[PDB]
Amino acid sequence: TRKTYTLTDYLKNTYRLKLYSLRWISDHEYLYKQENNILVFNAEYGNSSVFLENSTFDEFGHSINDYSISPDGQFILLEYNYVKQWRHSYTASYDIYDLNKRQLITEERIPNNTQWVTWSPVGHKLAYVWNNDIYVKIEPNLPSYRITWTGKEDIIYNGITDWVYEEEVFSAYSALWWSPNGTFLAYAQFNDTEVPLIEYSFYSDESLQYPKTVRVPYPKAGAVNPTVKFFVVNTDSLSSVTNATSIQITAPASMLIGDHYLCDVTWATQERISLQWLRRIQNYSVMDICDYDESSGRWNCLVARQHIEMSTTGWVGRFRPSEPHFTLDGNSFYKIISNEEGYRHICYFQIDKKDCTFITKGTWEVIGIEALTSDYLYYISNEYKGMPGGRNLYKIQLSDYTKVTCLSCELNPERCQYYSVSFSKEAKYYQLRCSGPGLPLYTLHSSVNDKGLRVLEDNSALDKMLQNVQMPSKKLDFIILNETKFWYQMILPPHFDKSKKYPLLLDVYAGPCSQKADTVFRLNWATYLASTENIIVASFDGRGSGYQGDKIMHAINRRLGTFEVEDQIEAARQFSKMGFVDNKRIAIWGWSYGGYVTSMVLGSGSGVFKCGIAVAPVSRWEYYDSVYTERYMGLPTPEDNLDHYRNSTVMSRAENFKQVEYLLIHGTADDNVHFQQSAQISKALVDVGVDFQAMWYTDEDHGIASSTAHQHIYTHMSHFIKQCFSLP
Amino acid sequence: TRKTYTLTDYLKNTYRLKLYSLRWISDHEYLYKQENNILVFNAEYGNSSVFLENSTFDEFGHSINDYSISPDGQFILLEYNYVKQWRHSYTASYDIYDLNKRQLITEERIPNNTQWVTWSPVGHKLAYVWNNDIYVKIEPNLPSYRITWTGKEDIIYNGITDWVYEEEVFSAYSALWWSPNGTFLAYAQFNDTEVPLIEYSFYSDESLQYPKTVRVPYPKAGAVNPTVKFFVVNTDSLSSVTNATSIQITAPASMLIGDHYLCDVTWATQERISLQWLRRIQNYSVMDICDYDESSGRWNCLVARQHIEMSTTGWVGRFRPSEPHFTLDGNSFYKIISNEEGYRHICYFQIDKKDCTFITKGTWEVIGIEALTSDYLYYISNEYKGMPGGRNLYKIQLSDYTKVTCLSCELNPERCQYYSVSFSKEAKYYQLRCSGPGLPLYTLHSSVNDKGLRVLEDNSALDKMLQNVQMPSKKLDFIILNETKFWYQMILPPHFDKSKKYPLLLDVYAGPCSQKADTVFRLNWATYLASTENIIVASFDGRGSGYQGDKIMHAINRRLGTFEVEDQIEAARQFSKMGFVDNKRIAIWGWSYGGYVTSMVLGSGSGVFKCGIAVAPVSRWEYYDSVYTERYMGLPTPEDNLDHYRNSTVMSRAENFKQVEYLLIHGTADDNVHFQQSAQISKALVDVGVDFQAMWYTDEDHGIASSTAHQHIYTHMSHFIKQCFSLP
Numbered sequence A, B: 001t002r003k004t005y006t007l008t009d010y011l012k013n014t015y016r017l018k019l020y021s022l023r024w025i026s027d028h029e030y031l032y033k034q035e036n037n038i039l040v041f042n043a044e045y046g047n048s049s050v051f052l053e054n055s056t057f058d059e060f061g062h063s064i065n066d067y068s069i070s071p072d073g074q075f076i077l078l079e080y081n082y083v084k085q086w087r088h089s090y091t092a093s094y095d096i097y098d099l100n101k102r103q104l105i106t107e108e109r110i111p112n113n114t115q116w117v118t119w120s121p122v123g124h125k126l127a128y129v130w131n132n133d134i135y136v137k138i139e140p141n142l143p144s145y146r147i148t149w150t151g152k153e154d155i156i157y158n159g160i161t162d163w164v165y166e167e168e169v170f171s172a173y174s175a176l177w178w179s180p181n182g183t184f185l186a187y188a189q190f191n192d193t194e195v196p197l198i199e200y201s202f203y204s205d206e207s208l209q210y211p212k213t214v215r216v217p218y219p220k221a222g223a224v225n226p227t228v229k230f231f232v233v234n235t236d237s238l239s240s241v242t243n244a245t246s247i248q249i250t251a252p253a254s255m256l257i258g259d260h261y262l263c264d265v266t267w268a269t270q271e272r273i274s275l276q277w278l279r280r281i282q283n284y285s286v287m288d289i290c291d292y293d294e295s296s297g298r299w300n301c302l303v304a305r306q307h308i309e310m311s312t313t314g315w316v317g318r319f320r321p322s323e324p325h326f327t328l329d330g331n332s333f334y335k336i337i338s339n340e341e342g343y344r345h346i347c348y349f350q351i352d353k354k355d356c357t358f359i360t361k362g363t364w365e366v367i368g369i370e371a372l373t374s375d376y377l378y379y380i381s382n383e384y385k386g387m388p389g390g391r392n393l394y395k396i397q398l399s400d401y402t403k404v405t406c407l408s409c410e411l412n413p414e415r416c417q418y419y420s421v422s423f424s425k426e427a428k429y430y431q432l433r434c435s436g437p438g439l440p441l442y443t444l445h446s447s448v449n450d451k452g453l454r455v456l457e458d459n460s461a462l463d464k465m466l467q468n469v470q471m472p473s474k475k476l477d478f479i480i481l482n483e484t485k486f487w488y489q490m491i492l493p494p495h496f497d498k499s500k501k502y503p504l505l506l507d508v509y510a511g512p513c514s515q516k517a518d519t520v521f522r523l524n525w526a527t528y529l530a531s532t533e534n535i536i537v538a539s540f541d542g543r544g545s546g547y548q549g550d551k552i553m554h555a556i557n558r559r560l561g562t563f564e565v566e567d568q569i570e571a572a573r574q575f576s577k578m579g580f581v582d583n584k585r586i587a588i589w590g591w592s593y594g595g596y597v598t599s600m601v602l603g604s605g606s607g608v609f610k611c612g613i614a615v616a617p618v619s620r621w622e623y624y625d626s627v628y629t630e631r632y633m634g635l636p637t638p639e640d641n642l643d644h645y646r647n648s649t650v651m652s653r654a655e656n657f658k659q660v661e662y663l664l665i666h667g668t669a670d671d672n673v674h675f676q677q678s679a680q681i682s683k684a685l686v687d688v689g690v691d692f693q694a695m696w697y698t699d700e701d702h703g704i705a706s707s708t709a710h711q712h713i714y715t716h717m718s719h720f721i722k723q724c725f726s727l728p
């Protein structure tokens, strides 16, 4: 009898999934790390060489957290002293190593505690943010040029984002953009002067006698948001003037009438930049295309080149307006937008014409535009087999839209239905990354003829190990509700037997544009629960889920805490009606948005669930951040949508928690979903006399990802689940 | 067959203990509130008259929290708008009603948010504190005089204590002391300028969008402490034209050499005041005796009248140097101090004489001095039957110390072994309050011949109700350890059968000078645990406990977390060896200091305990307040006692928790034992991979006493204990 996939296996990573992370440094060479050694590979022949021996920094006196080679290969940026902050932000120290002279630079070093640094796209110019101010170095060993003087901790951010812009808008800490050949440096400036502060205690190491109070500007729903400004400085003039001028590009009149956001920055050419602005009521965005005026050194955006993008049924974009992809001459661009049927497709735009032309269509959607050459546009979509949970790479002929080739569909249809792609500098080569439903597979391909060059990593090692293990199986299918298909997936125990009644755990996220039913292969907690505990773990994408058209995604518009909650309850009913589910043992759990939904479900009084676990849940929308909350709920005022804000809290369903077993967990240093949210749930439960289980994690954030806490929380949830299901 | 004392009975107070709280207003009469009516009683005969009708304030508007009748019976201070702060502090609104003219006063009324107010001991003058400043009103309807102007929130405290002085020194918010006839008003002034602040979150009602941050000047061990000054002001010579003049009495030189505290203020006569000062290293105190000089108007404290009290084995006094009891003329006084054998007895002092004379002696202790006349001194001790957990009222003839008469011992030996007393003004009458082992019994007596006048309240109603309940019994006995006897108590289930094995729960506090083994009758959680769950609840008084001499109490000096912890493990070990205890089911629980001991026991690796519960425990002494911690631990510096501060923590024992079941509870708004303490405990367990149970209580402080929380915590603990014991 083969062993099963146990909890320890999951927590200890005994069965390691291999990947192949490469970095294109040109149109046909990439870097790969093998044995702490940085090797350079020739894509065409697969032959390589040592780019940087591991023994190169033995006597550095510091552990190098990451590296970055300048575009011209002349220098390398060494990052150490990594200090994590939020999801993407962190501070670190940096040193530059001169590859040709093989000497480490020791003059005019990058300051310690630098918030962000990036090479220019070409050459070896450097731009970094320190103490909230931007600096540029034309040469690694020369003095820096200061670009801004207004930077102020927690107040003015130049070149970097504030908490909400980092988390909800740019998904990055940096807020600066080098133009294509590096002449100009554009950046955003955020002013959080009047933004309220979230405050919580951080206890730190046992040696700290007095707890520290963390204070970060964070706008909750309906609160004062940060204002923003955009500028562009010409770095080429830095060595000719004492103080180079940052030219401001003001937002359009349609945005200045009220609160708004800068939501996208994309350079089109060396002298044309595009910007998208979004109104605080996120259903109206504007794109300005601005050209450099050489005579006045100013930037002008002709209204004839201004493009409007709005929505009548919801917000704009899946999570925000999509990014434009310009043709070489910068006179036209491709952008994904939802069509008249509500499906997201690629529209072709002339920069000075408002009507665009869709180049793809159908009851499926384009996930993203991956590359654009003078002849072809490549993109990933879920068109194949009508599976919204699948992903494939396509190629469309620019001179004939009826010519579309699927570059990955048939490569290995039984093992690979979820693809990701990585193109070389000029798209001459591309690495395909298959992540499911079989073992991940990485392959390298040639664009000139779309031929497979070779297999980079097939995970044979793991496949070998997984042979002596009773692995669970995965079922991806759908059920029909109101003439509409709704997908679900099930992690089934080994030797599944449909004649038996298995306990069921509904794994839920269910946030707007989410997708929990897909063809991806994962080794996670559900693997253990299904393999060792013979527990069926299920997920369901109901109303509000993504990649299936706006009719489904925008169904929860201004109504969070309703349909996506009910549909989840309905999904459980349908499952127990499949005959292999023990209706007496049905649980539900989720994290983040999932915790909210789990809590809302447990408080519905449906009688369908026996117990449930919520990890770091939202409890009332007024406690979450403005950008994300208002996108779906509008403003919490009586003139807008306050009644629903008050009607969709977890606390108001406290009395119904008497019918179930609840486990509430939250990290105390959670800067995203504040502990406050679970503190209010627990108080509501205590207030109506409801018993439940709770667990706080000291100094842990939204991810509760520290190694020990990660193991502690899943171990704790396992006991609770096993107990609720009466499992030995 | 009949009902048992259930958890609901404990939580809903089904069985209420009746009391008889009277207030002496002279040497012959007292006030007693009955049916919301205030009656005046004649002690000699028991006849009464209505002093103030309950309906007198029907249309008052506000709900009266409490009342206070001026010493001359002319006025009544009405308290409303009560808002609790710490253990003793609070603010409220006050109104003064004229009893003579049966009219409420509307002119020059006491401000709102008043921090403290008190009548003068004689007549009807008033002294109140508002915005940290002292005010005085000679007549209820006249404008008040500002005494201090330095009052500054969280910085300068005039007439009221800061956090630590309130909690650890005076056990009161008040820092005002009227001279006997009200001529003088002495007060202390606290300066917390450099005292670090403890900060934590307060969430409030769910309507509060942003959590509030509470900040309180709180000196942890080793931190900067507040400084203090003492003043005396003549209130008979106040002017509305000139600012009042305060005369400062500085501390003795032996104190000014370093950090110190003002630990006691006691007026001797109309013109003589005594103050005791304590060095930061709490084993050396000094009493100054100051006389008013009618010539200069200054207060002079003759060095010849200075009295030093020190300890070579520990700190001075039980929790602080005891209070002196002066004779009528104020030339001599009585005070409890430990004798050469280490037992606390009454010493008689001459104000200008260095050697005092002990008037009581023996291997037992005087608890407190209760009354003094020219012929007798009345006191309470635990001498009777050599039971350190019993209390009785005695009187000793001042002209012949060999004549000691016990006044309560034989009143009702089977029902009453624990007395408390309340004398009238000149000690002409006294009320005896028996609180165990039987039901509380209140009686009135006459001092002239120690006659028992009458029974005020015998709780015969409760007695009748308890007859239909299967109530548990209490066993008080001792065990021997190294020639020394240590007492313990066991709450035994109904129909106790020593031939059966009962699970056992150790109820522990064990702080320095604590006593958890006594003859007091209580209806609490343990009553329910024994009566309904058939669990034995034991408590043990080991090394470090009080009322048994310094050899036992000072055993833990400079070494907390050692002997008192080891002694509990020994008691349990010994109880486990008794025939009626199931050694496979032994548990331990505690709150505050008891939470610390419980945690230290569970992390000892003794193997005696299966599970335990810790509520708001101290986890490392550097986190607790200075005045209390340093009293027993000295300073946490390497030249003093830092090493023991570092190895007396719970965190260091984390690894040993693997073999027990632990439930850790704590209120998030705990201003006493900061949540930080449990937060560091949880983080430590997480770090070594130990699973445990937790529960935080949103916005609850150290007593987790709000109605809903109190029911919730005990419900949750009851479930945990029953599950640990396999009890249905």
Ligand SMILES: *[C@@H]1O[C@H](CO)[C@@H](O[C@@H]2O[C@H](CO)[C@@H](O)[C@H](O)[C@H]2NC(C)=O)[C@H](O)[C@H]1NC(C)=O
Binding pocket: A040, A041, A042, A045, A047, A048, A049
């Ligand atoms: C990968 O292999 C190719 C071809 O084998 C290498 O090309 C070299 O091209 C230069 C041209 O100046 C010749 O002098 C070398 O002799 C060629 N090498 C060989 C082996 O023929 C290329 O350098 C290799 N790249 C890497 C990264 O190893």
Ligand SMILES: *[C@@H]1O[C@H](CO)[C@@H](O[C@@H]2O[C@H](CO)[C@@H](O)[C@H](O)[C@H]2NC(C)=O)[C@H](O)[C@H]1NC(C)=O
Binding pocket: A150, A156, A191, A192, A193, A194
């Ligand atoms: C950031 O925004 C704040 C306003 O929220 C600006 O501060 C104001 O500046 C004006 C002009 O200097 C003053 O008259 C006001 O007193 C300021 N108001 C406040 C609330 O501080 C600030 O100048 C902006 N900073 C930048 C760099 O744009």
Ligand SMILES: *[C@@H]1O[C@H](CO)[C@@H](O[C@@H]2O[C@H](CO)[C@@H](O)[C@H](O)[C@H]2NC(C)=O)[C@H](O)[C@H]1NC(C)=O
Binding pocket: A149, A150, A243
């Ligand atoms: C470089 O130029 C900028 C922009 O003119 C200067 O910033 C101004 O600084 C003055 C005071 O030093 C302020 O009154 C202005 O409000 C600032 N404007 C901006 C946009 O920040 C900056 O000080 C200059 N640096 C040097 C060294 O001259």
Ligand SMILES: *[C@@H]1O[C@H](CO)[C@@H](O[C@@H]2O[C@H](CO)[C@@H](O)[C@H](O)[C@H]2NC(C)=O)[C@H](O)[C@H]1NC(C)=O
Binding pocket: A181, A182, A183, A234, A236, A270, A271, A292, A294
């Ligand atoms: C990058 O693009 C910029 C902008 O077009 C180039 O700068 C211009 O260079 C031309 C020379 O053909 C001059 O006429 C202009 O004065 C420059 N404009 C500005 C704003 O500086 C720049 O030469 C390009 N860089 C490289 C390396 O080719």
Ligand SMILES: *[C@@H]1O[C@H](CO)[C@@H](O[C@@H]2O[C@H](CO)[C@@H](O)[C@H](O)[C@H]2NC(C)=O)[C@H](O)[C@H]1NC(C)=O
Binding pocket: B181, B182, B183, B236, B270, B271, B294
């Ligand atoms: C309270 O005691 C004070 C102090 O002994 C009394 O005030 C003194 O009274 C005498 C007699 O009239 C005066 O000659 C002194 O000048 C007063 N001394 C001071 C410091 O004021 C006061 O009379 C007593 N109060 C009552 C109500 O008896």
Ligand SMILES: *[C@@H]1O[C@H](CO)[C@@H](O[C@@H]2O[C@H](CO)[C@@H](O)[C@H](O)[C@H]2NC(C)=O)[C@H](O)[C@H]1NC(C)=O
Binding pocket: B281, B283, B284, B310, B311, B312, B313, B634, B639, B640
């Ligand atoms: C009061 O306690 C202190 C501290 O225990 C005693 O002072 C000295 O403290 C240091 C550091 O712990 C020791 O090395 C000394 O042995 C202690 N004694 C002396 C004389 O230095 C102090 O003695 C105690 N005071 C009394 C009256 O017992």
Ligand SMILES: *[C@@H]1O[C@H](CO)[C@@H](O[C@H]2O[C@H](CO)[C@@H](O)[C@H](O)[C@H]2NC(C)=O)[C@H](O)[C@H]1NC(C)=O
Binding pocket: B029, B040, B041, B042, B045, B047, B048, B049
């Ligand atoms: C208790 O009873 C006595 C009666 O013996 C009351 O009488 C005393 O006081 C009265 C006024 O307060 C007078 O009218 C009596 O003359 C006086 N008698 C004696 C012997 O002192 C006394 O007041 C009563 N006390 C109360 C509180 O009701």
Ligand SMILES: *[C@@H]1O[C@H](CO)[C@@H](O[C@H]2O[C@H](CO)[C@@H](O)[C@H](O)[C@H]2NC(C)=O)[C@H](O)[C@H]1NC(C)=O
Binding pocket: B150, B156, B191, B192, B193, B194
């Ligand atoms: C309260 O105590 C403070 C601190 O001991 C006194 O001020 C002193 O400390 C300040 C801050 O550390 C210094 O800035 C001052 O120079 C120092 N002395 C003075 C006179 O301020 C402060 O005066 C005290 N206040 C009262 C009313 O006693």
Ligand SMILES: *[C@H]1O[C@H](CO)[C@@H](O[C@@H]2O[C@H](CO)[C@@H](O)[C@H](O)[C@H]2NC(C)=O)[C@H](O)[C@H]1NC(C)=O
Binding pocket: B109, B110, B111, B112
């Ligand atoms: C303390 O506050 C109370 C309530 O605010 C004051 O009482 C009055 O309350 C009414 C409304 O209830 C207000 O309009 C008045 O301004 C308040 N003052 C008066 C004189 O009516 C109360 O007066 C305050 N205490 C003091 C000493 O002023």
Ligand SMILES: N[C@@H](CC(=O)N1CCCNC(=O)C1CC(F)(F)F)Cc1cc(F)c(F)cc1F
Binding pocket: A167, A168, A169, A171, A319, A511, A592, A593, A617, A618, A628, A672, A673, A702
């Ligand atoms: N804050 C939101 C960010 C977000 O949704 N993305 C970044 C912006 C674009 N979109 C994405 O795909 C994600 C990824 C993911 F979070 F997974 F949705 C996530 C988020 C939602 C929520 F309801 C919580 F209570 C907590 C939380 F962290």
Ligand SMILES: N[C@@H](CC(=O)N1CCCNC(=O)C1CC(F)(F)F)Cc1cc(F)c(F)cc1F
Binding pocket: B167, B168, B169, B171, B319, B511, B592, B593, B616, B617, B618, B628, B672, B673, B702
């Ligand atoms: N802070 C201490 C106050 C104290 O002990 N008293 C006030 C001063 C004089 N003494 C007493 O008798 C008490 C009564 C009691 F607290 F019950 F001991 C109590 C205390 C001790 C401890 F270890 C904690 F973690 C929390 C706590 F609240």
Ligand SMILES: *[C@@H]1O[C@H](CO)[C@@H](O)[C@H](O)[C@H]1NC(C)=O
Binding pocket: A035, A036, A037, A054, A055
């Ligand atoms: C490079 O260093 C790593 C780690 O020290 C080691 O595994 C590897 O053997 C080294 N490179 C080679 C070619 O051995």
Ligand SMILES: *[C@@H]1O[C@H](CO)[C@@H](O)[C@H](O)[C@H]1NC(C)=O
Binding pocket: A093, A109, A110, A111, A112
């Ligand atoms: C960065 O910090 C280190 C450690 O303090 C210091 O030695 C070094 O000089 C610093 N480098 C710079 C550029 O400030």
Ligand SMILES: *[C@@H]1O[C@H](CO)[C@@H](O)[C@H](O)[C@H]1NC(C)=O
Binding pocket: A281, A283, A284, A310, A311, A312, A313, A634
């Ligand atoms: C944008 O959303 C608001 C809120 O529902 C709505 O009133 C307004 O008409 C919308 N604009 C468009 C173009 O739909």
Ligand SMILES: *[C@@H]1O[C@H](CO)[C@@H](O)[C@H](O)[C@H]1NC(C)=O
Binding pocket: B035, B036, B037, B054, B055
């Ligand atoms: C005073 O009011 C209480 C209730 O508040 C009531 O029980 C009592 O009867 C009243 N007093 C009298 C003398 O009736």
Ligand SMILES: *[C@@H]1O[C@H](CO)[C@@H](O)[C@H](O)[C@H]1NC(C)=O
Binding pocket: B149, B241, B242, B243
């Ligand atoms: C009393 O002292 C205060 C505090 O300095 C001052 O402001 C006030 O004017 C003084 N009043 C008189 C009458 O001197």
